[PDB]
Motif scaffolding. Structure first.
Motif, PDB file in Angstrom:
ATOM      1  N   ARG A  85      71.343  28.096  43.683  1.00 30.78           N
ATOM      2  CA  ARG A  85      72.081  27.029  44.486  1.00 30.78           C
ATOM      3  C   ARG A  85      72.234  25.812  43.523  1.00 30.78           C
ATOM      4  O   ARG A  85      71.170  25.639  42.484  1.00 30.78           O
ATOM      5  CB  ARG A  85      71.206  26.406  45.361  1.00 30.78           C
ATOM      6  N   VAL A  86      73.507  25.407  43.323  1.00 32.08           N
ATOM      7  CA  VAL A  86      73.699  24.493  42.054  1.00 32.08           C
ATOM      8  C   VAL A  86      73.064  23.323  42.174  1.00 32.08           C
ATOM      9  O   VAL A  86      72.836  22.691  43.218  1.00 32.08           O
ATOM     10  CB  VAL A  86      75.213  24.083  41.954  1.00 32.08           C
ATOM     11  N   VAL A  87      72.302  22.819  41.074  1.00 31.21           N
ATOM     12  CA  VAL A  87      71.594  21.711  40.990  1.00 31.21           C
ATOM     13  C   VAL A  87      72.173  20.713  39.991  1.00 31.21           C
ATOM     14  O   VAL A  87      71.814  19.409  40.128  1.00 31.21           O
ATOM     15  CB  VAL A  87      70.261  22.208  40.529  1.00 31.21           C
ATOM     16  N   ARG A  88      73.024  20.888  39.025  1.00 29.80           N
ATOM     17  CA  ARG A  88      73.704  20.090  38.015  1.00 29.80           C
ATOM     18  C   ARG A  88      74.991  20.744  37.744  1.00 29.80           C
ATOM     19  O   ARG A  88      74.956  21.742  37.296  1.00 29.80           O
ATOM     20  CB  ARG A  88      72.731  19.825  36.799  1.00 29.80           C
ATOM     21  N   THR A 113      79.620  38.253  52.717  1.00 29.73           N
ATOM     22  CA  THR A 113      80.552  37.418  53.472  1.00 29.73           C
ATOM     23  C   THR A 113      80.064  36.644  54.657  1.00 29.73           C
ATOM     24  O   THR A 113      80.601  35.993  55.157  1.00 29.73           O
ATOM     25  CB  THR A 113      81.592  38.407  54.127  1.00 29.73           C
ATOM     26  N   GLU A 114      78.905  36.922  54.713  1.00 30.20           N
ATOM     27  CA  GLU A 114      78.180  36.222  55.705  1.00 30.20           C
ATOM     28  C   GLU A 114      77.616  34.821  55.328  1.00 30.20           C
ATOM     29  O   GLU A 114      77.885  34.545  54.042  1.00 30.20           O
ATOM     30  CB  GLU A 114      76.624  36.701  56.372  1.00 30.20           C
ATOM     31  N   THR A 115      77.161  33.844  56.190  1.00 35.12           N
ATOM     32  CA  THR A 115      76.570  32.564  55.973  1.00 35.12           C
ATOM     33  C   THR A 115      75.943  32.413  54.441  1.00 35.12           C
ATOM     34  O   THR A 115      75.059  33.378  54.142  1.00 35.12           O
ATOM     35  CB  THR A 115      75.931  32.004  56.916  1.00 35.12           C
ATOM     36  N   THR A 119      72.712  27.047  52.063  1.00 36.55           N
ATOM     37  CA  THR A 119      73.017  25.898  52.558  1.00 36.55           C
ATOM     38  C   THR A 119      73.646  25.901  53.982  1.00 36.55           C
ATOM     39  O   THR A 119      74.042  24.784  54.665  1.00 36.55           O
ATOM     40  CB  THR A 119      74.127  25.257  51.748  1.00 36.55           C
ATOM     41  N   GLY A 120      74.008  26.990  54.584  1.00 39.87           N
ATOM     42  CA  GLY A 120      74.497  27.235  55.641  1.00 39.87           C
ATOM     43  C   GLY A 120      76.122  27.037  55.794  1.00 39.87           C
ATOM     44  O   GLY A 120      76.875  27.319  56.582  1.00 39.87           O
TER      45      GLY A 120
END
Ligand code: FES
Length: 127
Positions: A85-88, A113-115, A119-120
């Protein structure tokens, strides 16, 4: 697509788990040839997802920083948590994902391809 290690060999799950310690994150050749992290979980099992190591800023391959539990890009400093997950920035998006499954003993990556479980949000890479 069958994952291939840095030497061009198919990744055989049972063998991989014998030489890669729990918590290990090593690059393999994934979907469309993209470097993709194969992760050995805490309980000594392969994670069910692979993390595409291609930075979302300009495409440098992002290494894992075990000390901080972050993938940190050496090109312009983009940072991502241990799940990608991007943090910076400058990267605007999280590292793409791939499903990680085992077929006849071989690790295979398959399109995600699913969620985006992190992050949803819908996956940005699958449109
Ligand atoms: S290519 Fe990763 S910070 Fe720019």
């Amino acid at each position: 697509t069958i994952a291939k290690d840095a030497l061009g060999n198919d990744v055989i799950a049972a063998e991989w788990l014998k030489t890669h310690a729990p918590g290990d994150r090593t690059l393999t050749q994934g979907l469309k040839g993209d470097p993709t992290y194969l992760v050995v979980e805490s309980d000594k099992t392969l994670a069910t997802f692979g993390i595409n190591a291609v930075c979302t800023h300009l495409g440098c391959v992002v290494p894992f920083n075990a000390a901080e539990n972050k993938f940190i890009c050496p090109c312009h400093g983009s940072q991502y948590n241990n799940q990608g997950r991007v943090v910076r920035g400058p990267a605007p998006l999280s590292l793409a994902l791939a499903h990680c499954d085992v077929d006849d003993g071989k690790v295979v990556f398959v399109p995600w391809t699913e969620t985006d479980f992190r992050t949803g949000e819908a996956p940005w890479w699958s449109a």
